[PDB]
């Protein structure tokens, strides 16, 4: 349906500037996941380090080294006690933040995959979920350090994962131009969505838990629901050729924060299907867009070692 | 700023520590390895002092080399290479004796054809335009035996020449050094390797010094 969404009054052109200039990184940034308290964020460097930055005071607290030099992604626990790290060595290390007699100590090393950890997420303190590069976005535990559920059904490899506030379901897009909605309870795939040509770089999730948006490398975004089984809205641009590499939603869901490879980002409207604002100011292409739970900050993780909060 | 002073001091301390770690890491040059299956990897990683990728580090002539052997990667090359910006050079290990054999994947393409396709793929990407390639040629004695037993006319139909080893090695030196679009920013250093001729680290040392010098000159426009 595209006729009922044309009667809403347009929000207009919105322009937002940077707030903090998180300087200190000397390598590339691939994933900067945001916490739940809307205050701390985690940033994955590329040389050897993983820094949990602060947003208000803009002062680092833990810049912990890693056994793996390459860190593909990162995840911050909803409780703020553990962090998950990606990489290519198939070691999703879980560092303990709030530890006794020390700053930060590693708890368990998650091994048993053959691809590469592309996008880790945390359902709760213990039950966590990863997304490897060998088409195994299996679920993990911290106490035993072994998998409990394995998700299969993607032809190619998967490189994106997003959770739900209900924590019971989660959608994840693979490089075969398909996003599958897995269920944590049964472990099977509810539905695989089709309609995009290029691979799904990164995927987001709607705040209510009834829709999502996928990031395709074909300069096209889509708003796919969970109970409609059909693409509702699409966002395409003519004067660009690169594709989105990270999509995120705000606290309301109208502002779709998309990140292209034009060394900038964009804010789409989920109802008017028009580019509201262009967020420029990055020397390199953006790699991740982290929006808070209350829409208080929109951080970007471009490869220029600069994290800019556009709020 | 009253009670947060300790927080800012700890932030500055860990920032100095991170800067020291980054300066120490930049002192260690990073190299990746590519090639076909069993193309002479053990012969070069066992002479140094030293699922997922392998990362080794060894010191030679007051210089730290960080070798990254991808080896077996279940995921596609388009992903982990796409996120490998900031490397000085790459290494391409091949065996010239793998021209009369056919890989057990399609039974229709030659191993040299697959190596040339991999080279054209890694040389025509938007991430390795300013990155150099060092070609390692493993088991040159096996290649000599094969070229003394096989005339090479079955692998390359357009090739024409006599039956020897020097001109074949020269043709190989001119076969993998022309697939790139330009040679000013895509310099290639080829070297042979076999059971003999130990301590071949001097070649890769000279190559990495040359490529980092050329990079530093291109930074300031001196090249």
């Amino acid at each position, epitope marked *: 349906l595209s006729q009922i969404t044309n009667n809403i009054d347009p929000v207009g052109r919105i322009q937002m500037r940077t707030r903090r200039t998180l300087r200190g990184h000397l390598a590339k940034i691939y994933a900067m996941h945001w916490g739940t308290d809307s*205050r*701390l964020l985690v940033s994955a460097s590329q040389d050897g380090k993983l820094i949990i930055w*602060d947003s*208000y*005071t803009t*002062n680092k*607290v833990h810049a912990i080294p890693l056994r793996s030099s390459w860190v593909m992604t990162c995840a911050y626990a909803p409780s*703020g006690n553990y962090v998950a790290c990606g990489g290519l060595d198939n070691i999703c290390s879980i560092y303990n933040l*709030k530890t*006794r*007699e*020390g*700053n930060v100590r590693v708890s368990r090393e998650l091994a048993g995959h053959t691809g590469y950890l592309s996008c880790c997420r945390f359902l709760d303190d213990n039950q966590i979920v990863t997304s490897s590069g060998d088409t195994t976005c299996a679920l993990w535990d911290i106490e035993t350090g072994q998998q409990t559920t394995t998700f299969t059904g993607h032809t190619g490899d998967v490189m994106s994962l997003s959770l739900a506030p209900d924590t019971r379901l989660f959608v994840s897009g693979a490089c075969d131009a398909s996003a599958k909605l897995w269920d944590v309870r049964e472990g099977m795939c509810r539905q695989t969505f089709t309609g995009h040509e290029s691979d799904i770089n990164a995927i987001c999730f709607f705040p209510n838990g009834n829709a999502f948006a996928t990031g395709s490398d074909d300069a096209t975004c889509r708003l796919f629901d969970l109970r409609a089984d059909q693409e509702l809205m699409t966002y395409s641009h003519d004067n660009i050729i690169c594709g989105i590499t990270s999509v995120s939603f705000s606290k309301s869901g109208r502002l779709l924060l998309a990140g292209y490879d034009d060394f900038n980002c964009n804010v789409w409207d989920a109802l008017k299907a028009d580019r509201a604002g262009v967020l420029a100011g990055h020397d390199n292409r953006v790699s991740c867009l982290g929006v808070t739970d209350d829409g208080m900050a929109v951080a970007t993780g471009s490869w220029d070692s600069f994290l800019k909060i556009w709020n | *700023s*009253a*009670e*947060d*002073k*300790a*927080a800012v*001091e*700890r932030s500055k*301390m*860990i920032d100095r520590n991170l800067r020291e770690d980054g300066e120490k890491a930049a002192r260690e040059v990073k190299l990746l390895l590519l090639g076909a299956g069993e193309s002479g990897k053990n012969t070069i990683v066992k002479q140094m002092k030293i699922t997922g990728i392998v990362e080794t580090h060894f010191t030679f002539k007051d210089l730290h080399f960080k070798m990254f052997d991808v080896g077996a990667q279940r995921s596609e090359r388009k992903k982990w290479i796409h996120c490998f910006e900031g490397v000085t050079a790459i290494i391409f290990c091949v065996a010239l004796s793998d021209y009369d054999l056919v890989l057990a994947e399609d039974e229709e393409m030659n191993r040299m054809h697959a190596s040339m396709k991999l080279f054209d793929s890694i040389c025509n990407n938007k991430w390795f335009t300013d990155t150099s390639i060092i070609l390692f040629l493993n088991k040159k004695d096996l290649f000599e035996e094969k070229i003394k037993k096989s005339p090479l006319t079955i692998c390359y139909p357009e090739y024409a020449g006599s039956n020897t080893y020097e001109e074949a090695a020269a043709y190989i030196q001119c076969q993998f050094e022309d697939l790139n679009k330009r040679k000013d920013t895509k310099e290639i250093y080829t070297h042979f390797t076999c059971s003999t001729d130990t301590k071949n680290v001097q070649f890769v040392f000279d190559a990495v010094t040359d490529v980092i010098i050329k990079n530093n000159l291109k930074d300031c426009g001196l090249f």
Partner: single-chain antibody, 232 residues
């Protein structure tokens, strides 16, 4: 993990001795240390503080220019030089660690310390009570006042609570007056305005005979006060 002190005994006013606090089991290079002493008749008083990693120095008003403290991370020790000693310094010196960041738990673990005997701008805060009989299991509500408004620009108060059990180190009870620390049950509830503070304790347990002390970290001077003791 451990904090063991040694070098005590009988000293003369104006002499010289070497005191250290040996600690091992944590990152000593990323933890600031204090030297809060405890007199048998006077409440605790902070004297000196070093930042994490031999950084800044913090002193008191009556000690600036008299004492000198150094640290050694490779040796993991604390070098203290006690010169110009007076006859009124009988106290229990501690070697307490602390770390300060967003959501940190400062003054989490306190040392043991050794005793010693001898022969013959500033922020001050008063208390409410001195020693009242409290029965175990009555949901005790302890109150406290201050001489300043805890309305810092960051948006949170700075009030830490401590208790010294007989023969047990003065461990931490609650930090920032609204967030429970590690090692305490889920029974303490701290609240109040910027001037006055209150702390409710429901479902009390045994061995609750320690004295309560308060601490503010708005400025360099750290004053604990007299002390509100609890009876049986």
């Amino acid at each position: 993990v451990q904090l063991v002190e040694s070098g005590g005994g009988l000293v003369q006013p104006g002499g010289s001795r070497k005191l250290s606090c040996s600690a091992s089991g944590f990152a000593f290079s990323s933890f600031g240390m204090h030297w809060v002493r405890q007199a048998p008749e006077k409440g605790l008083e902070w004297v000196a503080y070093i930042s994490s990693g031999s950084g800044t120095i913090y002193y008191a008003d009556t000690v600036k220019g008299r004492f000198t403290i150094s640290r050694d991370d490779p040796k993991n020790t604390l070098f203290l030089q006690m010169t110009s000693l007076r006859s009124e310094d009988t106290a229990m010196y501690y070697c307490v660690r602390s770390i300060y960041y967003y959501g940190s738990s400062p003054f989490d673990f306190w040392g043991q310390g050794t005793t010693l005997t001898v022969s013959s701008s500033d922020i001050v805060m008063t208390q409410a009570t001195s020693s009242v009989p409290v029965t175990p299991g009555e949901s005790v509500s302890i109150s406290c006042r201050s001489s300043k408004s805890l309305l810092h620009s960051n948006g949170n108060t700075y009030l830490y609570w401590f208790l010294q059990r007989p023969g047990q180190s003065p461990q931490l009870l609650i930090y920032r007056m609204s967030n429970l620390a590690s090692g305490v049950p889920d029974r303490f509830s701290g609240s109040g305005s910027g001037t006055a503070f209150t702390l409710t304790i429901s479902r009390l347990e045994a061995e609750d005979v320690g004295v309560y002390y308060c601490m503010q970290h708005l400025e360099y001077p750290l004053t604990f006060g007299a002390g509100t003791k609890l009876e049986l």
